[PDB]
Structure 1
């Protein structure tokens, strides 16, 4: 109900602010929408004229993704190359460990 224009107890928050992101919070068999200033891990924001909703990162093996198919950073052991998860760097690219991504 924090920062929610219309919040309830069962449904929880039904409408956040016009610029604030609305996310459906699911807890087992109990689910209710809520307000979060930004999408959590595994989610990427989707700004829309009506209202803003958190979107699950469909991109595989990605901790936080920027958009539909671009990943900010993947999990450990899966390097970052053009925003994609790769176990090893491809041809023409060298592995990098400390900052966990692909380089030349």
Structure 2
């Protein structure tokens, strides 16, 4: 119950602060709200004027995404190209392992 406008014991947080992300955590059957300054891996913070909520990174092969489809960094075995995950660097591009992302 940190940074929570209204925290209940059974349901955890239910209304985050003004500038905070409301995130739902699943554990066993227990599901409860939380307030974080930044949504965790696999989620992108979607702002709103009423309450700001995290949503799943819908783009596949992604572990951290800036928006619903732009991945800042893919998992292993997939170089980053314009925020999209490709196992190989396409034409006009070559693999670059040092930062694990597609370069010209």
Query: Which runs of 4 or more aligned residues in structure 1 lie more than 3 Å from their structure 2 counterparts after TM superposition?
Result: none
Query: What 5-or-longer segments of structure 1 have no aligned partner?
Result: none
Give aligned pairs, total. Answer: 104
Q: How far apart are the structure 2 equivalents of 1:8 and 1:34?
A: 11
Equivalent position of 1:35 in the other structure: 35
Deviations 1:15-49 (A, max 9, x none): 01011111011112110011111010000000001
**Structure showing the higher strand proportion among its residues:** 1
Residue 62 of structure 2 corresponds to 62
Measured on the aligned residues, the alpha-carbon RMSD in Å equals 0.6
Spell out the pairing of 1:17-56 with structure 2 (5 A cutoff). Answer: 17-56=17-56
Length-normalised TM-score, structure 2: 0.97
Deviations 1:34-67 (A, max 9, x none): 1111010000000001110011111101010000
Q: Which runs of 5+ in 2 are unaligned?
A: none
Instruction: Return the offset for 1:82.
Output: 0.4
Distance of 2:61 and 2:29 partners within structure 1: 26
In structure 2, what is the Cα distance between the partners aligned to 1:66 and 1:88?
A: 22
- TM-score normalized by structure 1? 0.97
Matches of 1:85 and 1:93 in 2, distance apart?
14
